[PDB]
Ligand binder design. Sequence first.
Ligand code: GTP
Ligand code: MG
Ligand code: ZN
Ligand code: ZN
Lengths: 177, 124
Amino acid sequence: SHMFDYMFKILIIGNSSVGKTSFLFRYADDSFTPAFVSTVGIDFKVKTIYRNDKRIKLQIWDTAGLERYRTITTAYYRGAMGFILMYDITNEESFNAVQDWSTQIKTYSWDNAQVLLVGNKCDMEDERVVSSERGRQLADHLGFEFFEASAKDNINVKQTFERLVDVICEKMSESLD
Amino acid sequence: EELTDEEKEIINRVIARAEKMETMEQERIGRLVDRLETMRKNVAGDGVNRCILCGEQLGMLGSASVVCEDCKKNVCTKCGVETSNNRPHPVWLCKICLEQREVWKRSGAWFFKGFPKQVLPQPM
Ligand SMILES: Nc1nc2c(ncn2[C@@H]2O[C@H](COP(=O)(O)OP(=O)(O)OP(=O)(O)O)[C@@H](O)[C@H]2O)c(=O)[nH]1
Ligand SMILES: [Mg+2]
Ligand SMILES: [Zn+2]
Ligand SMILES: [Zn+2]
């Protein structure tokens, strides 16, 4: 039965072009591509890691941000243990959408679902429109952990997934007496 | 909604290889669950005067005893496992409930508080 202890299903959601797929390809295969191929519906990758004295298999789903595939992507929420809700730090709209995605999560997912708010592209400090203090402030107001990172320059990305994983592990440990 | 050309064709693939992963997950969990049931069937005691697992009496027979935090039955120190964290007065678990927790964790049931069924077929 393979060589692992747990399997965590993780979904990455947020407006189109915020860099959801890139964030994935950088964590999985460690590869960035300035090109922009909008994702068709959904897709996923598998990655086994060894953390907290446990072999963990991560099934990481990459969802389409376009309102077009809402119904098909939301159908996969109910199985998720953790979410990565990201926005572009150089795009006000994507950041304004956060509140909505938050609702989207409350509706189609279970309660223990852990959520991490990620402000991507923190390498483009020249085109920054959202301040760290605002993202942080929103994160606190929604009860989510906050991270600012960049797929392109592999920064704070691994630390994002690792925090998700540990957060889920602690909820697991808390669910037992 | 909207229409969908060959996009379906692109999506069904992902679905297909996701459903195949679900099949294997059911086999991994199935083995864990089945092993556990067998342990349950081998309960010989009542948890009252005689240990719940083996069936040997408790008390002046020289057999120490404890109460299991999860099923509330009495178990001898032999069929029991002293669990311990960073706080005095540790909780005990009978061997079956200890395995129960391992299953509830490794299968993801701890999350859904049970075993769910994600039936997401392919849109032909
Ligand atoms: N500068 C910079 N660009 C990034 C970063 N991450 C992604 N991009 C770029 O942002 C654009 C879109 O990236 P994707 O990863 O395709 O975003 P997406 O949200 O998954 O797209 P949808 O599937 O349509 O939702 C691409 O042109 C990437 O090269 C980053 O950290 N920094
Ligand atoms: Mg994409
Ligand atoms: Zn016994
Ligand atoms: Zn017990």
